[PDB]
């Protein structure tokens, strides 16, 4: 087990979205630090309110087996999207304990940046997941499309993955 298996999920269904560039520029820092062959999938390659033999090659089975998770959503209506939460509503309630999650979010401006603490961290603390100390809200300043002071926040948030894996990564029941 020399390399972690990373998955990526972005809650933007559109093809050339700015959320898919954020989740693609997340594993490369981990893959290039330590990892192999990240599963990066957009929510267009999903079963979005259609389990029954769908594209659960690229949603469910890669998500639950991953050693590291990066999760992202466009900020719609002061919170994440609905199609993002429909994917989360299908997870078993205790399925992601001991799992590192990196929170990310894209929006219109620099406003609405309490979605990391008040919207995404309560949902992934419901799963009792190892939420990292650095979630990152980005504005529409990116054109691995990135720009200033979000790249250093992203590179230093993936550095919090390998900092709880040292010496060869050392009433309810599922």
Residue numbers in the entry: 1 to 50, 56 to 148, 152 to 178, 190 to 193
Manuscript text:
In order to understand the structural basis for Pden_5119 catalysis, single crystals of this enzyme were prepared and used to collect diffraction data (resolution range 48.75–3.1 Å). The monomer takes a flavodoxin-like fold with a central β sheet made up of five parallel strands in the order 21345 which is sandwiched between helices 1 and 5 on one side and helices 2, 3, and 4 on the other side. The oligomeric state in solution was analyzed by means of small-angle X-ray scattering (SAXS). Ab initio modeling using the SAXS data obtained at a protein concentration of 1.5 mg·mL−1 (73 μM in monomer) yielded an envelope that has space for the dimer. Therefore, we can conclude that the dimer represents the major species in the solution. Despite co-crystallization and soaking trials, we could not obtain crystals of Pden_5119 containing bound FMN. The FMN molecule position was therefore predicted by in silico docking analysis. Further inspection of the isoalloxazine environment implicated three amino acid residues, His-117, Lys-82, and Arg-116, as potentially involved in catalysis. The imidazole ring of His-117 is positioned to form a hydrogen bond with the N3 nitrogen of FMN similar to the case for homologous His-112 and His-116 residues in SsuE and EmoB.
The Pden_5119 protein oxidizes NADH with oxygen under mediation by the bound flavin mononucleotide (FMN) and may be involved in the maintenance of the cellular redox pool. The findings so far indicate that the Pden_5119 protein shares functional properties with both flavin reductases, which use flavin as a dissociable cosubstrate, and flavoprotein oxidases, which contain flavin as a permanently bound cofactor. It follows a sequentially ordered mechanism where FMN binds before NADH and the binary complex enzyme-reduced flavin formed after the hydride transfer persists for a long enough time to be oxidized by molecular oxygen. Structural and kinetic data suggest that His-117 plays a role in the binding and positioning of the isoalloxazine ring of FMN, Lys-82 fixes the nicotinamide ring of NADH to support the proS-hydride transfer, and Arg-116 with its positive charge promotes the reaction between dioxygen and reduced flavin.
